[PDB]
Amino acid sequence: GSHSMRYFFTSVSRPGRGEPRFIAVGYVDDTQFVRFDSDAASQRMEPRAPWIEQEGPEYWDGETRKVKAHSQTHRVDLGTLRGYYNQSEAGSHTVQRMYGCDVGSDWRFLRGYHQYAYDGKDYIALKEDLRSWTAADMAAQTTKHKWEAAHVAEQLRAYLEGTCVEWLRRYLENGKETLQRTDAPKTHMTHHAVSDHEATLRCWALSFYPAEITLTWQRDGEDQTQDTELVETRPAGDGTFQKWVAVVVPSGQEQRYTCHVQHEGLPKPLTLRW
Amino acid sequence: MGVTQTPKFQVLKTGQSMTLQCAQDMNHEYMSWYRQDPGMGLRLIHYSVGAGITDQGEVPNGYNVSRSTTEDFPLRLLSAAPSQTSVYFCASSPVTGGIYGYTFGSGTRLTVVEDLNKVFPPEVAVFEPSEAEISHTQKATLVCLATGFFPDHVELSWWVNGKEVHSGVSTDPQPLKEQPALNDSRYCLSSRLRVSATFWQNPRNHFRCQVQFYGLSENDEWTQDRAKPVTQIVSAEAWGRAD
Amino acid sequence: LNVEQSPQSLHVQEGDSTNFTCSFPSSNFYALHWYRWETAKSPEALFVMTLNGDEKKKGRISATLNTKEGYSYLYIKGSQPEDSATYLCARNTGNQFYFGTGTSLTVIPNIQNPDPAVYQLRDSKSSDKSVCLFTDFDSQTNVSQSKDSDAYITDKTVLDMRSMDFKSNSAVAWSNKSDFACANAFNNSIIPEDTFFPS
């Protein structure tokens, strides 16, 4: 399948308190490999996956330096945007940034992205071609004009196609044993008494990787998707994920519904009856 | 443009403090101070990425700054050491994290001397065209020579009949140590004014080079027998002649 | 962290063509800068180079960039006295830029039928310092001084304008004696053969 490297930025202002809070994290396909927090005791970019530790000399000088540089940009970004939207030094506000690239099964550059939100709502983002911008509003329009003359998208293309990928590939080679290792969804079912007339049936999927998965039921192939609750995927804490789908059923009529499951781990689209 | 930067020239007695003023009026976020010392070119002192944010540079020791506003970025020299002698520049650029080039301030020359005792005004002298240069190619050349000054803070102009001429003048770019050995040396500065052989032959003309020296201010203590080496102009004048 | 600039100093003839160089760690490159810095004035942004292989070029001046083996050349085509100055080179580290040593360049103007000659000029207080003067001083030497110990030399090449031709590369020497003696004040230098002495 495909592969990913994304970086996530969150800087939040704090009026009375001092400098705004800055958290940056780095991911490689559902695996965080580094982090920086402006309040961390170290004040350096830290390792989060045992395959980036085996590279601990001058790699952390630039990363620390460029992450501190990003933080610097975000500090100003909060004033600029406050001026744009005519806000005050009262409350706290939030900017976000996310960039990275995708590579295919061959590992030739597949996709590249870079987006930015203020206070949860989109603000400006880089299109698929990586040559132009999308303005959420008239303030984001000013940043589009500024950024165009600063030729920011050009510098983005170069990195997103050059360094961004060249290194994804590197990391993939470095940590093949876990990043390129896909686990299997160990699935099971349950059945609970909600009253004296109706039952449940919950369909599970545990200790798998990556987080992409699918589950449902069907009565006569005709998928039910009514009276359900497909909860969000949850991290186990060890690099694995979980998920479940549930349904409402008469304690008599039950054996007409199955349970579908999809995942890289094992080929055949495993199905389950109770 | 641009980046206004004050003052141009300055002498300081060791341990004395000072504020270097630089201001811009273009809404440039980024502002920074570099110093200049031969062999290493421009080394960064303190930089500023926006209003309220200040950050250290390559060589921040002994200087501090503030940036409470977009326009100004003052360089304060806590306590002048003789190694703080240098040339300073204040540079800015429109967007932080952007690629724009720095539009630089004017630049200031700073000398930190032990005792203000070391400061000397210059001695301007003019020199008549070679009465054989005229007889050779038909051109006249006047030479202005300022010597024995410290520190190297001067501006050399000329004046024909009373007008500041730039036509035909070639001053030196920078003052030179009288003998590069060594720091008891005063400084030197020269200029050739080449005009028509027959134009200097015309006795009605008043040639004059002048040199503004930037030195002491009625403000610093002056306890020596010689005149006070303040900031002042000094001129060697001359007249044409067909005699 | 380190921006090497080479050569440090070069004199070249008017109308000739150099092409100095600036190399840097290619690790984390993002952009590069070139500056013209006229002697005793503020540096001034020349080029802003970012992408690999791209070759910016303005006037009789140009520049290349190899971001992978970290280097950039600054070429000058038909060169001129005006193009004399220290040329600087900066790369990013922040949010920051780091200038290199800087490469100082002098362009010596050649002449309408050269007039190599040495003259002496007397002051206004009769006989003192009697400055020496060397017109059309040939720069095969031009290291710093010449026959110097208790002598002072400030020879430097300058320019315009025009009427009977003018591009000022003379030389000048003086002393504390007046017993000094011109047509003799330029020993450590290697002046031409046609040099002209009036006595």
Partner: peptide, 9 residues
């Protein structure tokens, strides 16, 4: 590897 520079909005 991070982008070396992120320009302000």
């Amino acid at each position: 590897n991070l982008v070396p520079m992120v320009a302000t909005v």
